[PDB]
Design a protein around this ligand. Structure first.
Ligand SMILES: O=C(O)/C=C/c1ccc(NC(=O)C2(NC(=O)c3ccc4c(C5CCCCC5)c5n(c4c3)CC(=O)Nc3ccccc3-5)CCCC2)cc1
Length: 538
């Protein structure tokens, strides 16, 4: 079937949408084999060990982001979080309807996503806007009731150590380094699927449900999962922001609770089956949605090239063709997975420390957009948290934003940021404790950065018109001095985040209060498009 069908009614604002529509619109041809069936049975056997809880209306309401799109039925995210009678009554009727109606397609809104990318006129032109498909607020709360515990627990139970979202950036690095070191002669590659969401078939969605159905579930949760699969997950009609009929979808919706979980399970299933078809030796996989990384035993240069073509042919049959053809790599640092690469630095005692980094162009351009205009989500804050050990996040992002927060006297004001797909409300004064917990004390003492990493950062600053690193060192010293003068958590920000800036670097002992932070919900699962929210506690 066609991934999408269109009426011709425009994807309306809340211009490049038409270019995206052409790429994502195609008929899918899927052919399954015994490798696929074997991997599926193995995945199902692991899913069989899961017991999932039905969330109450209240618990599901508490997970709703405060700025989540309002319902077309006379209530918004604030009403949901406050447990308002109107919101609650509507949620209970949406739920009752899921239990009673097993067939009627549920309506979804289609929107062009507004994302900031860097204006590079050297290697090509402007990329089209991504498309977001999501159901009404009442349906989104019901999804949580039936599937929040499933999407949070099942991927790890099924995929084990291959499930990427259970790891913090440091644990992701440790996984990859250990996998690389475990091989006699390692070879690794990233597999990029062309428009993954559009490659997801109705059968892929039902196979995914077959995995969810292996959980121990309450009868209502079981019915709701069955109804949500047929009425929403498999496809349904598309409505633009103006309320007009845009067409229809027969592929993955990017804005449903099961997007991340479903994409991870589907990518894993297809990739593990393709590994067997290609006869890749001693495979270690790391999957994050449609992002796949494979580390295996090299069979020789020519053999490795042949095995990747074979892997690609199998992924193509399974309806996961490549965007860019995969390339074998013989250094771990050369693999870009989740837009990131492994790099190494030294701690205060000269000991080797592996960390995750990336090209800083997009993070800096988005930070520049956020500094210029008020935004709902602060990507700069997410990049500080995720890339805390990096030269660019420490010297540029921390320095720039802490000088702004000092000037605005907003150090204690909680800000919303995304941690892989979920929304977290974080006070910037909590950054030293968060960083210590996710990356370790060494994140504040790292030095001896690689020449390639230093050069990538420096060239990027030049290209974007950002002052050089020496200017940032000078700015951090003033920022640090002012933070120190304030005491408490503000002084900790100065002492810990800006220890790299000082002439004579300070000792740095663990932050006593860091252990108190409740990071239990943090690196459990991916919730991209899942409409998930949390406020940082203790
Ligand atoms: O020879 C030497 O010794 C070096 C000298 C030198 C060179 C340039 C400056 N620049 C400045 O002082 C000003 N800008 C900045 O001090 C500045 C700060 C952050 C900047 C950013 C980002 C960095 C990441 C957080 C968001 C802000 C960008 N740009 C920035 C400029 C340059 C800019 O204007 N815009 C963009 C656009 C895209 C990406 C980055 C930028 C402020 C007043 C006049 C312009 C200062 C000193």
């Amino acid at each position: 079937s066609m991934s999408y069908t269109w009426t011709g009614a425009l994807i309306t604002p809340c211009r490049s949408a038409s270019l995206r529509q052409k790429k994502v619109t195609f008929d899918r041809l899927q052919v399954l084999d015994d490798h696929y069936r074997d991997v599926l049975k193995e995945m199902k056997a692991k899913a069989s060990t899961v017991k999932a809880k039905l969330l109450s209306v209240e618990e599901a309401c508490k997970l709703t982001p405060p700025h989540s799109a309002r319902s077309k039925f006379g209530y918004g995210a604030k009403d949901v979080r406050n447990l308002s009678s109107k919101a609650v009554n509507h949620i209970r009727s949406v739920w009752k309807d899921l239990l009673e109606d097993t067939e009627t397609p549920i309506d979804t809104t289609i929107m062009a996503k507004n994302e900031v990318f860097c204006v590079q006129p050297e290697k090509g032109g402007r990329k089209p806007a991504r498309l977001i498909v999501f159901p009404d607020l009442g349906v989104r709360v019901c999804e949580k009731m039936a599937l929040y515990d499933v999407v949070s627990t099942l991927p790890q139970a099924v995929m084990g150590s291959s499930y990427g979202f259970q790891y913090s950036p440091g644990q992701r690095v440790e996984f990859l380094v250990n996998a690389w070191k475990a091989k006699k002669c390692p070879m690794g590659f990233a597999y990029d699927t062309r428009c993954f969401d559009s490659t997801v078939t109705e059968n892929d969605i039902r196979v995914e449900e077959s995995i969810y159905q292996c959980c121990d579930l309450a009868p209502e949760a079981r019915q709701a999962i069955r109804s949500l699969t047929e009425r929403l997950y498999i496809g349904g009609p598309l409505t633009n922001s103006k309320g007009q009929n845009c067409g229809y979808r027969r592929c993955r919706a990017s804005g449903v609770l099961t997007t991340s979980c479903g994409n991870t399970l589907t990518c894993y299933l297809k990739a593990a089956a393709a590994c067997r078809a290609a006869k890749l030796q001693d495979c270690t996989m790391l999957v994050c949605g449609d992002d796949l990384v494979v580390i295996c035993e090299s069979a020789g240069t020519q053999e490795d090239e042949a095995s990747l073509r074979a892997f690609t042919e199998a992924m193509t049959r399974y309806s996961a063709p490549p965007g860019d053809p995969p390339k074998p790599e013989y250094d771990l640092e050369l693999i870009t997975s989740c837009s990131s690469n492994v790099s190494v630095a030294h701690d205060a005692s000269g000991k080797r420390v592996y960390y995750l980094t990336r090209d800083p162009t997009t993070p800096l351009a988005r930070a520049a957009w956020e500094t210029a205009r008020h935004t709902p989500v602060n990507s700069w804050l997410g990049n500080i948290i995720m890339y805390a050990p990096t030269l660019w996040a420490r010297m540029i992002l921390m320095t720039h934003f802490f000088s702004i927060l000092l000037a605005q006297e907003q150090l204690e004001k909680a800000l919303d940021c995304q941690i892989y797909g979920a929304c977290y409300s974080i006070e910037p004064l909590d950054l030293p404790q968060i960083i210590q917990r996710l990356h370790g004390l060494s994140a504040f003492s790292l030095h001896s950065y690689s020449p390639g990493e230093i050069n990538r950062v420096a060239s990027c600053l030049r290209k974007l018109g950002v002052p050089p690193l020496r200017v940032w060192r000078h700015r951090a010293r003033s920022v640090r001095a002012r933070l120190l003068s304030q005491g408490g958590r503000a002084a900790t920000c100065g002492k810990y985040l800006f220890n790299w800036a000082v002439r004579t670097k300070l000792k740095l002992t663990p932050i006593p209060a860091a252990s108190q932070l409740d990071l239990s919900s943090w690196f459990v699962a991916g919730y991209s498009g899942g409409d998930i929210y949390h406020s940082l506690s203790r």
